[PDB]
Amino acid sequence: MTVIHRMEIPVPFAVETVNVFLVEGETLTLIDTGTNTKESRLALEKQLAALGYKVEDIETVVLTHHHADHCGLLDIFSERTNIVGHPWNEPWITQNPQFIKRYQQFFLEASVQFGVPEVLLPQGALLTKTMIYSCKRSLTHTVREGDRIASLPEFTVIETPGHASTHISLYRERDGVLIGGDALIGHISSNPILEPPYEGEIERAQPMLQYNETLKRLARMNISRVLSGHGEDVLDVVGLVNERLQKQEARAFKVLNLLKAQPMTAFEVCVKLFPTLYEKQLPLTISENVGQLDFLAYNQQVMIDKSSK
Numbered sequence: 001m002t003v004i005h006r007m008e009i010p011v012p013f014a015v016e017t018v019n020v021f022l023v024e025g026e027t028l029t030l031i032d033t034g035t036n037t038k039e040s041r042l043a044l045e046k047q048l049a050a051l052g053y054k055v056e057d058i059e060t061v062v063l064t065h066h067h068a069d070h071c072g073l074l075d076i077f078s079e080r081t082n083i084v085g086h087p088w089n090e091p092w093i094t095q096n097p098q099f100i101k102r103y104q105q106f107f108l109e110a111s112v113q114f115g116v117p118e119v120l121l122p123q124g125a126l127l128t129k130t131m132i133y134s135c136k137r138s139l140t141h142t143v144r145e146g147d148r149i150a151s152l153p154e155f156t157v158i159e160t161p162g163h164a165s166t167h168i169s170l171y172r173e174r175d176g177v178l179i180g181g182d183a184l185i186g187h188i189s190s191n192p193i194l195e196p197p198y199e200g201e202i203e204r205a206q207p208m209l210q211y212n213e214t215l216k217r218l219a220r221m222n223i224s225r226v227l228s229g230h231g232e233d234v235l236d237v238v239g240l241v242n243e244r245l246q247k248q249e250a251r252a253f254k255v256l257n258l259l260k261a262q263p264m265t266a267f268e269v270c271v272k273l274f275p276t277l278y279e280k281q282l283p284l285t286i287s288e289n290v291g292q293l294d295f296l297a298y299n300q301q302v303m304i305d306k307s308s309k
């Protein structure tokens, strides 16, 4: 029945490549796409051609999540193509004007709240500004926990939030294969990527706790092999999860101990945690602080505008 192929698509991010998966079944399904770049598109087209296919032959595209490396080429697919993912992808992937306005307001406010020096901010650009690597295309179909995608009958949709709010993985009960997305990556942690609140969202799960719960769920599943969004397959999910949970705990303690010595802004903690990477890249830190603020381990001296932890 199905033949699954991994295609490695170049992306202009530190991870260098994204894994996309072509499933040759009764119809042709692609899982994830690559960024909205000429380079990504050319690579996808070339690798499809070597398999004897053109973009127009793909009848279903499934998104594991809304990050640009996974959805960015959505516009290229034929008008007949089913586009399937978590429902919350929709505002991101359509670049809904109201969503974009909210996104821009959130990040401006966040920059101030976290005390990011203006010189480091995307500002103009960065060899790259923002949102520019994403698509402008709607879903045709939404999926949630336990759902089946018509073109992938042996798989079940599992909600795997944490890395992103829109994150899903595809589980094949027959042989325990998971098309994981970015929920569990072998070589690097895939910790929560900060997002704006959705319109109407009063609250979301504590993101780090959600990520950890997703990890624990995966560890309890009977998974033989994770086909990951980046890097090599994961064959020992239990082992990897245990390691990641241990590392997360250590980092949380490191943050807690940093703050005991000197109360700090998020940016200041970031510079302590990532003394080399903070100029080249910008993550996390807030995830750890927010995790500790939940769990009532750390207080925020709100007042100034630049929050003090």
Ligand SMILES: [Mg+2]
Pocket (backbone or CB within 6 Å): none
């Ligand atoms: Mg059959």
Ligand SMILES: [Mg+2]
Pocket (backbone or CB within 6 Å): 004, 005, 006
């Ligand atoms: Mg192949």
Ligand SMILES: [Mg+2]
Pocket (backbone or CB within 6 Å): 005, 006, 007, 047
């Ligand atoms: Mg291949």
Ligand SMILES: [Mg+2]
Pocket (backbone or CB within 6 Å): 006, 007, 008
């Ligand atoms: Mg390959």
Ligand SMILES: [Mg+2]
Pocket (backbone or CB within 6 Å): 006, 007, 008, 009, 047
């Ligand atoms: Mg390849």
Ligand SMILES: [Mg+2]
Pocket (backbone or CB within 6 Å): none
């Ligand atoms: Mg054929």
Ligand SMILES: [Mg+2]
Pocket (backbone or CB within 6 Å): none
């Ligand atoms: Mg055929």
Ligand SMILES: [Mg+2]
Pocket (backbone or CB within 6 Å): none
């Ligand atoms: Mg045939």
Ligand SMILES: [Mg+2]
Pocket (backbone or CB within 6 Å): 046, 047, 050
């Ligand atoms: Mg090839």
Ligand SMILES: [Mg+2]
Pocket (backbone or CB within 6 Å): 006, 007, 008, 047, 048, 050
């Ligand atoms: Mg190939």
Ligand SMILES: [Mg+2]
Pocket (backbone or CB within 6 Å): 043, 046, 047
């Ligand atoms: Mg090639």
Ligand SMILES: [Mg+2]
Pocket (backbone or CB within 6 Å): 045, 048, 053, 054, 055, 056
């Ligand atoms: Mg083509």
Ligand SMILES: [Mg+2]
Pocket (backbone or CB within 6 Å): 044, 045, 046, 048, 049, 053, 054, 055
């Ligand atoms: Mg082609």
Ligand SMILES: [Mg+2]
Pocket (backbone or CB within 6 Å): 054, 055, 056, 057
């Ligand atoms: Mg074509």
Ligand SMILES: [Mg+2]
Pocket (backbone or CB within 6 Å): 036, 072, 073, 074, 075, 076
């Ligand atoms: Mg395009």
Ligand SMILES: [Mg+2]
Pocket (backbone or CB within 6 Å): 060, 082, 084, 141, 149, 150, 151
């Ligand atoms: Mg469909």
